[PDB]
Amino acid sequence: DNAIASNILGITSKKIENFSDWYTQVIVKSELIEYYDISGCYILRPAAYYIWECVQAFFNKEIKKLNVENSYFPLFVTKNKLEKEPEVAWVTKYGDSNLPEEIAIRPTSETIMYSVFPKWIRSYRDLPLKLNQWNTVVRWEFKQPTPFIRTREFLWQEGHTAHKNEEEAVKLVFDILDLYRRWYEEYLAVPIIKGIKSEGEKFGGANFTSTAEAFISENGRAIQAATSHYLGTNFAKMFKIEFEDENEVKQYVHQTSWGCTTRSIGIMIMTHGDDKGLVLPPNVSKYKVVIVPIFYKTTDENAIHSYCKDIEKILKNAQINCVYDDRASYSPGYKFNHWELRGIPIRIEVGPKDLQNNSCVIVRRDNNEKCNVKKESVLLETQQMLVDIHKNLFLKAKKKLDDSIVQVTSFSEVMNALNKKKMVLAPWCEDIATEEEIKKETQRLSLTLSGAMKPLCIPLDQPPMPPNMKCFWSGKPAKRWCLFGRSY
Ligand SMILES: O=C(C[C@H]1NCCC[C@@H]1OC(=O)NS(=O)(=O)N1CCN(C(=O)Nc2nccnc2C(=O)NC2Cc3ccccc3C2)CC1)Cn1cnc2cc(Br)c(Cl)cc2c1=O
Numbered sequence: 001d002n003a004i005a006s007n008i009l010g011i012t013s014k015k016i017e018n019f020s021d022w023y024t025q026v027i028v029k030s031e032l033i034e035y036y037d038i039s040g041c042y043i044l045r046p047a048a049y050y051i052w053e054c055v056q057a058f059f060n061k062e063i064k065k066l067n068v069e070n071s072y073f074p075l076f077v078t079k080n081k082l083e084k085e086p087e088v089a090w091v092t093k094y095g096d097s098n099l100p101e102e103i104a105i106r107p108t109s110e111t112i113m114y115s116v117f118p119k120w121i122r123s124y125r126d127l128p129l130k131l132n133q134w135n136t137v138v139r140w141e142f143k144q145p146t147p148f149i150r151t152r153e154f155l156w157q158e159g160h161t162a163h164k165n166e167e168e169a170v171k172l173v174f175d176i177l178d179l180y181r182r183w184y185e186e187y188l189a190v191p192i193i194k195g196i197k198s199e200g201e202k203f204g205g206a207n208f209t210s211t212a213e214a215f216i217s218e219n220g221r222a223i224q225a226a227t228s229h230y231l232g233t234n235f236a237k238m239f240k241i242e243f244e245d246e247n248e249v250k251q252y253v254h255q256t257s258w259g260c261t262t263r264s265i266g267i268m269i270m271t272h273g274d275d276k277g278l279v280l281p282p283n284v285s286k287y288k289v290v291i292v293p294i295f296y297k298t299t300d301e302n303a304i305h306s307y308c309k310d311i312e313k314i315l316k317n318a319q320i321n322c323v324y325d326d327r328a329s330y331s332p333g334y335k336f337n338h339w340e341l342r343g344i345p346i347r348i349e350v351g352p353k354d355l356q357n358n359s360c361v362i363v364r365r366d367n368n369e370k371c372n373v374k375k376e377s378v379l380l381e382t383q384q385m386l387v388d389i390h391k392n393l394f395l396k397a398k399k400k401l402d403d404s405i406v407q408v409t410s411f412s413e414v415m416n417a418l419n420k421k422k423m424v425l426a427p428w429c430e431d432i433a434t435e436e437e438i439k440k441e442t443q444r445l446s447l448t449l450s451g452a453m454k455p456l457c458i459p460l461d462q463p464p465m466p467p468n469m470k471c472f473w474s475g476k477p478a479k480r481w482c483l484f485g486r487s488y
Contacts, residue, residue, distance in 0.1 A: 148266025195457025277341030
């Protein structure tokens with residue numbers, strides 16, 4: 001429990017050698033996650049919840065442009081109402097007395113909301129209806145949990161809309177999907193692959209499911225990053241959500257729903273984190289800069305302290321939040337590891353020579369590259385470097401994603417691509433019967449998580465398909481290229 005020894009040790013598992021232990025150490029030592037006495041439930045500490053507040057402000061600002069309004073619906077669903085559509089958590093008593101009708105924690109708010117929609121929708125003048133919630137949902141599974149990405153309770157947003165026809169809803173589905181892209185690219189520097197889910201992997205209530213897929217290249221696992229469904233009139237028939245149209249004729253509404261969870265944070269940690277600890281894209285880090293003082297003698301102490309307070313004022317006047325670790329009990333080297341492990345994008349060092357030159361040293365977190373900068377240039381160099389740190393993080397990640405995809409044309413090359421922690425891009429006939437056949441065979445040939453291969457998504461960005469190409473599995477005419485891989 002010695003501070004210096006713990007500081008020098010940092011993360012002690014190498015990301016590439018022991019990924020599972022590497023991930024646990026990072027989330028605990030960078031002060032993101034705390035554990036709890038109920039399995040599969042975790043505490044979001046400030047540094048983690050700050051990230052959620054950043055993406056929440058962005059997604060709010062964007063869905064307002066689509067005229068989507070936030071709201072809040074009850075945490076509880078009556079058994080009577082939920083079972084009008086079996087791992088839900090059930091409230092059965094208050095104090096010591098049983099409830100006459102059991103009560104479920106929402107796993108999602110479909111039945112809670114769509115049950116009231118008919119009261120709000122009477123004619124076309126009431127459409128479209130566009131609602132969003134920021135809440136938690138509970139799903140009591142006994143699979144092995146994993147912080148951020150696979151938990152019994154998790155924070156998310158769920159948005160639900162209803163439209164007068166199909167095209168206006170289908171357009172909204174993909175408009176939201178691109179906001180999920182920007183959520184991951186512009187804020188978490190994580191590249192995703194837009195696609196359509198296979199028939200066997202889509203949401204049971206949707207006509208189609210569009211998805212944003214991410215890939216964890218260190219363990220070879222694909223993970224769904226966000227989702228956006230076109231529900232059609234399926235839920236309008238269940239709940240009788242009708243309206244009178246412009247011709248005075250009763251019609252069903254066309255609905256969409258879409259969500260993104262704190263799994264996005266987990267994906268971001270697994271992408272950018274290195275053997276030093278957390279690595280934060282500037283847009284989700286509270287402190288963009290850490291100012292560390294360095295003292296050669298005891299005489300230059302009052303000057304360097306004042307010089308660091310000048311740089312702090314320069315950055316904070318430009319609304320660039322920072323922190324000046326003026327603690328006298330720790331060495332500069334200690335502070336370097338301290339804030340590197342916590343993922344601060346930029347470190348500014350001020351020493352005696354840097355003060356004699358009226359300059360400073362600015363170190364990047366992603367690649368540890370240093371450069372000397374004049375004091376009057378500190379603000380401009382910091383601004384451009386925060387932008388380049390993001391771009392570098394994203395481009396390096398997009399490289400790892402692209403290199404994780406092996407385009408194949410026969411099944412005889414599938415197992416070799418899987419065992420190299422990759423996913424295959426294969427031409428597929430999209431027949432639903434083949435989805436389980438591919439799972440059973442890929443896991444059979446694999447010799448804890450599963451070894452089976454499942455249809456991840458059919459990408460929107462389709463490679464050229466020669467009109468005579470056949471399915472990599474059945475040999476029947478192929479329809480589109482499909483990503484297949486191992487998942488959680
Ligand atoms: O809701 C819907 C329809 C839509 N509704 C509005 C819009 C949004 C919806 O769009 C989706 O399709 N969302 S999705 O949830 O399917 N999708 C999103 C992307 N994913 C995440 O990011 N997930 C997470 N993020 C962070 C942490 N953990 C997880 C996570 O998965 N934990 C679990 C796995 C795991 C592993 C170990 C331990 C515990 C656990 C729990 C998960 C996949 C479908 N659905 C799902 N399930 C239901 C369940 C019941 Br019970 C009933 Cl009754 C109904 C439904 C139902 O209707």
